[PDB]
Amino acid sequence: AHHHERLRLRRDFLLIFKEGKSLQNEYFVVLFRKNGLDYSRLGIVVKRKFGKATRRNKLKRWVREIFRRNKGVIPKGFDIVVIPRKKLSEEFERVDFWTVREKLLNLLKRI
Ligand SMILES: O=C1c2ccccc2C(=O)c2c(O)c(O)cc(O)c21
């Protein structure tokens, strides 16, 4: 079999929101639910208010990279939805990739 990491977000966002668990810090909410697979999958939901397209797309690239490159510390078998918060929006231009990575991994490790 091949390697997959993308979540069926349109299909499953409501399910994960309702039936999943959640963790949060000042920058992110993470929703997660067991997926019956031997790997975890990621969806990213960025509210329009987070910023214009370029900023939203940058956040998405960052989060995808963090998920892709740190699977050794991210529990397996979960569908995971990452939602950036207003405070991250407010501080986004003052923080770097590595700061965002620390804050996201802190949550993903606790699933
Ligand atoms: O979706 C959620 C969410 C879902 C389940 C539990 C808590 C939250 C939550 O606390 C939250 C925020 O604080 C926020 O600022 C934007 C959000 O989108 C959420």
DSSP codes joined into one string, 43-79: EE---GGG-SHHHHHHHHHHHHHHHHHTTTTSPSSEE
Cα(87)–Cα(20) distance, rounded to whole angstroms?
Answer: 24
Helical axes 53-69 vs 97-108, angle rounded to 10°: 60
In which residue are the tokens 């910023």 written? 51
CATH number (2.40.160.10, 3.40.50.720, 3.30.230.10, 3.10.450.40) of 1-111 reads 3.30.230.10
Q: What phi, psi does 65 have (nearest 5°)?
A: -65, -45
Where do the domains of the chain lie?
A: 1-111
Cα(35)–Cα(80) distance, rounded to whole angstroms?
Answer: 9
Residue type, 39: Y
- Which resolution, in Å, applies to this structure? 1.4
Both tokens of 29, joined, read 């909410």
Method: X-ray
Cα(71)–Cα(80) distance, rounded to whole angstroms?
Answer: 12
DSSP state at residue 4: -
Question: Which residue lies with its CA nearest to atom 15 of ligand 1?
Answer: 85
13 Cα: distance to centroid of ligand 1 (angstroms) = 13
Q: In the beta sheet, which residues pair with residue 81?
A: 31, 43
The finding on whether 24 has its CB within 6 A of some atom of ligand 1 is yes
**Quick check: helix, strand or coil at residue 28?**
strand
DSSP state at residue 23: E
Residue type, 46: V
Q: Please state, as a whole number, how many other Cβ atoms lie within 10 Å of the Cβ of residue 17.
A: 14
31 Cα: distance to centroid of ligand 1 (angstroms) = 9
Please say whether the beta carbons of 53 and 15 come within 8 A. no
